[PDB]
Amino acid sequence: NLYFQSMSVGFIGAGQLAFALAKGFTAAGVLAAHKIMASSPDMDLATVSALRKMGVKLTPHNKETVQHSDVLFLAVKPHIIPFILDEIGADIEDRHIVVSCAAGVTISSIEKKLSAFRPAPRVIRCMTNTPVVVREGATVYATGTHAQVEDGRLMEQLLSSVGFCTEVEEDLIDAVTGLSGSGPAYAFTALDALADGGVKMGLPRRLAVRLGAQALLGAAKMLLHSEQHPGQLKDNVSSPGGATIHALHVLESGGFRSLLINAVEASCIRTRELQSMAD
Amino acid sequence: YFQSMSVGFIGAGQLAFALAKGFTAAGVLAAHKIMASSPDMDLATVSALRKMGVKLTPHNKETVQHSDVLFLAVKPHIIPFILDEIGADIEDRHIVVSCAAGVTISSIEKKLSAFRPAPRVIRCMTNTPVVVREGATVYATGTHAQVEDGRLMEQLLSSVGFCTEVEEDLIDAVTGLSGSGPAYAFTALDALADGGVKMGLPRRLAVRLGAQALLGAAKMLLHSEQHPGQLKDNVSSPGGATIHALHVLESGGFRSLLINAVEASCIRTRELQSMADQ
Amino acid sequence: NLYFQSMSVGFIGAGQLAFALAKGFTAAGVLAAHKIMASSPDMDLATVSALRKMGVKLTPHNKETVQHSDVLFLAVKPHIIPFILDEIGADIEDRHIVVSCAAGVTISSIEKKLSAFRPAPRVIRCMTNTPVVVREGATVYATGTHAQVEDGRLMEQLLSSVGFCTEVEEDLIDAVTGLSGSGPAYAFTALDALADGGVKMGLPRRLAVRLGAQALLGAAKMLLHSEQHPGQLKDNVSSPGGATIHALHVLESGGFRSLLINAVEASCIRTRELQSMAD
Amino acid sequence: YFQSMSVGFIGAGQLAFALAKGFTAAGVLAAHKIMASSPDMDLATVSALRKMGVKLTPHNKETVQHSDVLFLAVKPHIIPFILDEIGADIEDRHIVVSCAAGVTISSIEKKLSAFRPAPRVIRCMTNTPVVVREGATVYATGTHAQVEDGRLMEQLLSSVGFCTEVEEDLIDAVTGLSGSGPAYAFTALDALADGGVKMGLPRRLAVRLGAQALLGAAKMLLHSEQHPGQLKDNVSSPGGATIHALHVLESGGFRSLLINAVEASCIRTRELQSMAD
Ligand SMILES: NC(=O)C1=CN([C@@H]2O[C@H](COP(=O)(O)OP(=O)(O)OC[C@H]3O[C@@H](n4cnc5c(N)ncnc54)[C@H](OP(=O)(O)O)[C@@H]3O)[C@@H](O)[C@H]2O)C=CC1
Ligand SMILES: NC(=O)C1=CN([C@@H]2O[C@H](COP(=O)(O)OP(=O)(O)OC[C@H]3O[C@@H](n4cnc5c(N)ncnc54)[C@H](OP(=O)(O)O)[C@@H]3O)[C@@H](O)[C@H]2O)C=CC1
Ligand SMILES: NC(=O)C1=CN([C@@H]2O[C@H](COP(=O)(O)OP(=O)(O)OC[C@H]3O[C@@H](n4cnc5c(N)ncnc54)[C@H](OP(=O)(O)O)[C@@H]3O)[C@@H](O)[C@H]2O)C=CC1
Ligand SMILES: NC(=O)C1=CN([C@@H]2O[C@H](COP(=O)(O)OP(=O)(O)OC[C@H]3O[C@@H](n4cnc5c(N)ncnc54)[C@H](OP(=O)(O)O)[C@@H]3O)[C@@H](O)[C@H]2O)C=CC1
Ligand SMILES: O=C(O)[C@@H]1CCCO1
Ligand SMILES: O=C(O)[C@@H]1CCCO1
Ligand SMILES: O=C(O)[C@@H]1CCCO1
Ligand SMILES: O=C(O)[C@@H]1CCCO1
């Protein structure tokens, strides 16, 4: 177990991801809010104000975030990453671990930029998701060419405080993006629709929202704690001739399964395009 | 808080195991204060209840005599036969909690009232995630259930997940939403994992990531004051990977399928309510 | 607020957009009709005659419009824009603000043409829509390379008199075109169909058109004045088991949402396509 | 013009709140002339209505005693219970205005006439945009409504939107069109915003632009003597962006989905009543 409670963390970008991670870390108690600095050009944004009330240091100056930070998260859109690297590359020091969270952007492209200024930049690529805000994120990371022995362990310890975290080979991360990165939006869509179905059949909206969300949470937790296949868990719900198997039929008749496959594929493929676009 | 109270299950299958495991993990009931009965003493769910410390028997009358709260955890078409069997054994102290999909309070009271008047009946709809103490449960109180009977039930079932009282005429819809709900999620998680596998993830990792993503999103919604659509908006950046995937969901009518599912399960439950009452 | 009550405005092109803007500006009382001039090569057109009855000055000669104008709107079709710039480029003076309304046409292409004649053309690109004719348009604009300090402020002040107006980065305007530029046609199609539905269920056509249009106007205004997500207002107004949620289901079963996404995307892509051909 | 008139709401939900707020914003009633009652009123609604100047009570009989015009703004299956509760308290002066989907004048008059003959009953269908004074309202007059009662109703509801008299047999169809209409619009605006976001717009800007486009287009049609198809033709330049988007709407049967929606809501409305009768 590595000690990191005293280190300073910075976010280039002060948007949804910066807020979600900063909220998760502080709510986990593993970092003090004043250890965190975030920067963006527009300092009148809603996420910036949300970060403000949390106690995070805010500035328009990306260089200040770099000078403040030990671990530096890149939390801008993919096409902005190369501009950021040109802007702050000269301010990267030997102490810095650069953790890119941008969809699609390769370690190789980041190291190429930063190596123009200083050899051996310590780079880690991450994909996470917004439920880090409730400490139930799904995070993977890959270590770059010059990442020190314990840089990967440090990032795993830090990110494990706000959800599941595991090291992966970098060539998996675009597919992770399509599954758990975009995944919450799939779930919010599903929850909205399930609530609509509950309302159609006579439930108050607030109850339908609560029951749907609790059903999804409980089922997901069951699967995480089970050694059983999701199909077996499915079999355990449905009684012969019963209500559940009738509902499963109408899902199958609409190709429900194929739509979720389509979604993971579409997000992964778009992620690969966001890299060739920023390239 | 629930010291001295005895609980019994008529039926020893998926739901009886789930509830018994959840109650005992919650510490609200000692396993030996729980008795379950089913005809086949060799079944797998009875094997695990035994290892859990739950008293087991093949005779439904033993469960009735042991219990204060009596859970009916048999299939809907088996309830009328159970009530015929144990009807003469219902005492004044008993609270009979039917878990069966579609079986109406009216049908249970009519059966039991032939043996002794004022049976205290509660109908509930729960789901299998009570086994990890994250269930979703509603209940409706019967004609002769005392107000404190509904309160006791809510406190007991709140130990294993969300629990709230509803009017009985909403239980069919709840069945279609949170009762069948886990099966929709297991289907979705299997398909999401297939999608991860297609794009190059190992199956075990894809399952873990998809399930963690669903759990985290559901917790976000429960801990948020905000609309699911608002949370959808907040997490879909312009031109990004997520909004591209949302479009292909929309093009297949994803939302309508989940509406169809809740409706289909509810309507089938109503057909079961009509069988119970006819 | 800038004093511009006395300035002169010109339209190259005397068609649907020139009429809608001139009608909105004069109805707002911010420009006098005799301070507006519009040109097109055919002087017996219906929009020309409509502009005529409004008191706008009309001419076949684009050079006359340029010489008349302080603010010069380009309201010709996208493929006509480069010919106009070649025609009038030598007549552009220091006083001129050139406001292109053409779908897809980039500030860069306009400045490149005009710069061959005189350096530092003051260029603004906008996207608007025909409801400026009832002073409820939706307008965005981006400022060009040589736009002076108050050129953007002037154009926002002018266009705010006929609807919503805000500055954007130019790279958003093709998307805006697919949303609020083409938006009114989506609405007219929807209103025709809703009225057909009213008629099928027994309403006189005139009443069905009136009710459908009032419903759409009121709902849009409700959303604009609420601090609410449209899904929340959908949720709030629906009732369990009720008529609305049954109708929402049949919309969903048809993939209604996906069609509107398809439309915005198709209009935006077509807008981008035409400009790639122009380049 | 309604110097002394008092208005009551039985119910305090989405519709009662929207009408009370629209009437308040219109300034058509004197101060403290609105009362609303419900049995378990959400505290956020209590707070909002109280700050607005609206009187509140859990007792429906008190609303009746307060009111000259009494709006019934409860769910359709709740209407007959309300009529049984308040029927003995209806007075000569009262105009009872049912807002409930599906519920016929006939059924209301039969309930009320058991207590006192000649209840003055009006049935309306409106929509939540009355809250911004842009509602769409129709009404039908009952058997004993005096002719001036329908005139008063029209003048009152005209202060918060369009309002016109119809035969009662049109109201279920109106419900499917302008009653449910706003929900169709909110769905469309959410989808249009998703489309703007997909093509690169910030969500907040996409929502603002889509809503403004819808508002402006609707106002154009209301202020035009032309067919919506003709207004469509004026945007659709040959080979242009708009006609390309219209094609993909047509390829998905966009128009038929909206016809399906109006039909489905109207048919369900007829079931919200054929079940009650
Ligand atoms: N949100 C999610 O669900 C997840 C997102 N990600 C990744 O995180 C990154 C950001 O996503 P998200 O936070 O959602 O996007 P946001 O739009 O919410 O945040 C973007 C931030 O970048 C800021 N920014 C823009 N230009 C600069 C600049 N030159 N220097 C510094 N900051 C700048 C913006 O400020 P302004 O608005 O003022 O330009 C805004 O604060 C993306 O690459 C995405 O792939 C990864 C996992 C999950
Ligand atoms: N599983 C779920 O997801 C949920 C199910 N429910 C309801 O719970 C009830 C049971 O569900 P589930 O547990 O899944 O079904 P199972 O089939 O898994 O368990 C059924 C049990 O009933 C027993 N049984 C059959 N006949 C008798 C009898 N005459 N006397 C005593 N026990 C008997 C069976 O024993 P044997 O195997 O020996 O026949 C078995 O132990 C159903 O009514 C269902 O609607 C409600 C919410 C969630
Ligand atoms: N209509 C809309 O909904 C919106 C349109 N726009 C943009 O506005 C521009 C015009 O659109 P719209 O007004 O609809 O198209 P119209 O066809 O209605 O008007 C086009 C005008 O250009 C005139 N014209 C053709 N050649 C010349 C020329 N060489 N010199 C001067 N005028 C000429 C035409 O005259 P003749 O008929 O004699 O050729 C006609 O008066 C387009 O670029 C479009 O993208 C932007 C937002 C909304
Ligand atoms: N929502 C809409 O878009 C439109 C709805 N309508 C019609 O308006 C009526 C109400 O709809 P809506 O306002 O949406 O429904 P809501 O559910 O939002 O409001 C229902 C109201 O009825 C109240 N209520 C329930 N029982 C009683 C009672 N015994 N005495 C008094 N009040 C009671 C509820 O009380 P509590 O506050 O205690 O829960 C709540 O205030 C319906 O008939 C609907 O058809 C018509 C046009 C538009
Ligand atoms: O299909 C069934 O019978 C049960 C009821 C609710 C969960 O699945
Ligand atoms: O939509 C996107 O591009 C990012 C990546 C996954 C979460 O949201
Ligand atoms: O959904 C319903 O039943 C009501 C009537 C129309 C507006 O919402
Ligand atoms: O269809 C077109 O190309 C024009 C321009 C954008 C609005 O409608």
Resolution stated for this PDB structure, in Å:
1.9
Torsion of CA B27, B30, B35, B41, to 10 degrees: 90
Residue with tokens 């902005």: A80
- Domain ranges in chain C are 1-176, 177-279
Question: Hey, are the CB atoms on A220 and B218 less than 8 Å from each other?
Answer: yes
Complete DSSP assignment for A80-95:
GHHHHHHHHGGG--TT
Tokens of A239: 């009684």
Quick check: B138 and B124 in contact, CB under 8 A?
Answer: yes
Side chain identity, residue A200: K
In degrees, rounded to 5, the angle at the alpha carbon of residue B177 between the alpha carbons of residues D17 and B267 is: 100
Q: Please indicate if any CB of chain D lies within 8 Å of the CB of C277.
A: no
For residue C30, the distance in angstroms to the closest alpha carbon of chain D comes to: 20
In terms of phi and psi (left: phi > 0; alpha: psi -120 to 50; beta: otherwise), the region of B13 is beta
Residues 6+ apart with CB under 8 A from D268: C242, C243, C246, C247
Instruction: Say whether residue B252 is in contact with chain D using an 8 A CB cutoff.
Output: no
Which residues on chain B are in Cβ contact (under 8 Å) with A268?
Answer: 199, 241
Cα of first residue to Cα of last residue in chain A, in angstroms, is 37
Is some CB atom of chain D closer than 8 A to the CB atom of B244?
yes
The two structure tokens encoding residue A254: 């609409």
Nearest to D219 among C136, C140, C251 (CB): C136
Q: Which ligand is nearest to the CA of C138?
A: 3
Secondary structure of residue C105 in the 3-state scheme: coil
- Ligand 5 atom at shortest distance from the alpha carbon of A246: 1
Nearest Cα to Cα of residue D177 among C240, C219, C215: C215
Residues 6+ apart with CB under 8 A from C217: D129, D134, D214, D215, D218, D219, D222
Does C230 reach chain B within 8 Å, measured CB to CB? Answer: yes
Nearest to C196 among D14, D242, D259 (CB): D259
Mapping DSSP to helix (H, G, I), strand (E, B) and coil, where does residue D144 land?
coil
> What's the CA gap between C211 and C222, in Å, rounded?
16
Beta strand pairing call for B34-37 and B7-10: parallel
Transcribe B66-126 into DSSP letters. H-SEEEE-S-GGGHHHHHHHHGGG--TT-EEEE--TT--HHHHHHHHHTTSS--EEEEEE-
Q: Which residues pair with D65 in a beta bridge?
A: none
C91 with C69: CB under 8 angstroms?
no
Cα–Cα nearest to C214, from D158, D110, A200:
D158
Cα distance between residue C256 and residue A193, in whole Å: 14
Mutation test of the interface with chain A: which of C228, C232, C245, C249, choosing the one with the most A Cβ atoms within 10 A? C245
Angle between the C256-278 and D181-198 helix axes, to the nearest 10 degrees?
A: 40
Considering only CA atoms, which of C119, C75, C73 is closest in space to residue C97? C73
How far is it between the farthest Cα atoms of chain C? 68
- Which bound ligand lies closest to the C-alpha atom of B86? 2
Which CATH class, in words, describes the domain spanning C177-279?
Answer: mainly alpha
Residues contacting residue D201 through CB under 8 Å, at least 6 positions apart: B238, C172, C175, C176, C179, D209
Phi, psi of D122, rounded to the nearest 5 degrees: -125, 140
d(CA D166, CA D175): 12
H helices present in chain A, as ranges: 16-27, 46-54, 62-68, 81-88, 107-115, 151-160, 173-176, 183-200, 205-225, 230-237, 243-253, 256-278
Within 10 A of B15 (CB to CB), how many other CB atoms are there?
Answer: 25
Q: In Å, how far from its chain's centre is CA D114? A: 29
Contact D23, D7 (CB under 8 A): yes
Judge: domain D175-277, CATH 2.40.128.50.
Answer: no
Topology at the third CATH level for domain A1-176: Rossmann fold (3.40.50)
User: Cα–Cα distance between D165 and D172 in angstroms, integer?
Assistant: 14
Strands A122-127 and A97-100: parallel
Pocket test for ligand 5, best of B265, B268, B269, B272 (most atoms within 8 A of CB): B265
Q: HEC states along D26-67?
A: HCCECCCCEEEECCCCCHHHHHHHHHHCCEEECCHHHHHHHC
Query: How large is the C-alpha radius of gyration of chain A?
Result: 21
Mutate to test the pocket of ligand 3, among C12, C45, C65, C76 (most ligand atoms within 8 A of CB): C76
Q: Give the HSE-up count for residue A109: Cα atoms under 13 Å, Cβ half-sphere.
A: 22
Helix (H) or strand (E) holding C243: helix C243-253
Residues of A in contact with C236 (CB under 8 A): 205
Which residue of D77, D172, D219, D272 to mutate against C (max C Cβ within 10 Å)?
D219
Which distant-in-sequence residues (6+ apart) come within 8 Å of B4 by Cβ? none
D11 is in an annotated binding site: yes
| CA-wise closest residue to B193 among B212, B180, B179, B177 | B212
d(CA A17, CA A28): 16
125-184 of C, contacting A, C-beta below 8 A: none
**One-letter amino acid identity for D110?**
K
Closest CA to C131 of D238, D211, D188: D211
Strand order across the C71-74 sheet: C57-59, C36-39, C9-12, C71-74, C97-100, C122-127, C137-143, C163-167
Backbone angles phi, psi at D55, to 5 degrees: -80, 145
What does CATH list as the number for B175-278?
1.10.3730.10
Which residue, among D116, D9, D124, has the nearest Cα to D72 in the 3D structure? D9
**Residue D164, Cβ density class (10 Å: 0-12 exposed, 13-18 middle, ≥19 buried):** middle
Give, in order, the Cα–Cα distances in Å from D202 to each of B239, C173, C184.
9, 12, 20
Structural biology method used: X-ray
Q: In chain D, which residues have their Cβ closer than 8 Å to the Cβ of C229? A: 190
Are A11 and A37 a contacting pair, CB within 8 Å? yes
CATH of segment(s) D1-174: 3.40.50.720
